[PDB]
Amino acid sequence: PLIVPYNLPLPGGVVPRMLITILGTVKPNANRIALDFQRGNDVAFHFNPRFNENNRRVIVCNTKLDNNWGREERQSVFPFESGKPFKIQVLVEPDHFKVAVNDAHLLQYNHRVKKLNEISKLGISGDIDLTSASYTMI
Ligand SMILES: CC(=O)N[C@@H]1[C@@H](O[C@@H]2O[C@H](CO)[C@H](O)[C@H](O)[C@H]2O)[C@H](O)[C@@H](CO)O[C@H]1O
Structure with a gap:
């Protein structure tokens, strides 16, 4: 399917009620996943599942x-599983990015x-097979 690292343009930037949907499968023996919402060289929102940090699973955000x-900012709840298909949904709200994985917040x-309007691209990288990356307004 799609090539990783993958660049998904966000025309005119992000805006509240914008929903980004990433479909993929985690590779076996995966180490990392990263979503990077970028404003030029800055990374507005870095979403980084880590599979082996000191023999721990952890999501790092920064x-x-x-x-x-x-x-x-760290989330120890870790919904990703090596070898398994996932769905990441990122909903842009006025004050937060809201992230749900496999339909669970x-x-x-x-x-x-x-x-927000200057955050105009999403980079997708790491140890996944990427099935699709899209957005829509809800
Ligand atoms: C530059 C560096 O290695 N910093 C370490 C952190 O690792 C970076 O973390 C950011 C997000 O905060 C990115 O994920 C980047 O890709 C990582 O290299 C590391 O998480 C912390 C805690 O161990 O130490 C920093 O020194």
Whole structure:
């Protein structure tokens, strides 16, 4: 299917009620997954499942400004499974990114980058087979 790393343009940037849907399958022996919502060189929203950090599964979320990472937000609830198909939904809300995986709410990420309309691309990378990446307005 699609090539990874994958760049998904977000024409005119993100806006509340925008829903991004990523369909994929985690590769066997996977180490990492990363979604990077980018504003130019900045990463507005970095969503990074890690399969083996000190023999732990953990989701790391953060923001990258002027090539510096900020305070990490961590979610120990880990809905991904090596070898298995997943669905990540990212709903843009006025004050947060809302993330659900396989139809179950996972986490919220408060907006640190405030110029939502300038977050105009989503990079998709890591140890997955990518089936599809799309968006729609709800
Ligand atoms: C640059 C670096 O290695 N920083 C370490 C963190 O790893 C980075 O974390 C950011 C998100 O915060 C990105 O995921 C980047 O790809 C990672 O290299 C690491 O999470 C923390 C905690 O162990 O230590 C930093 O030094």
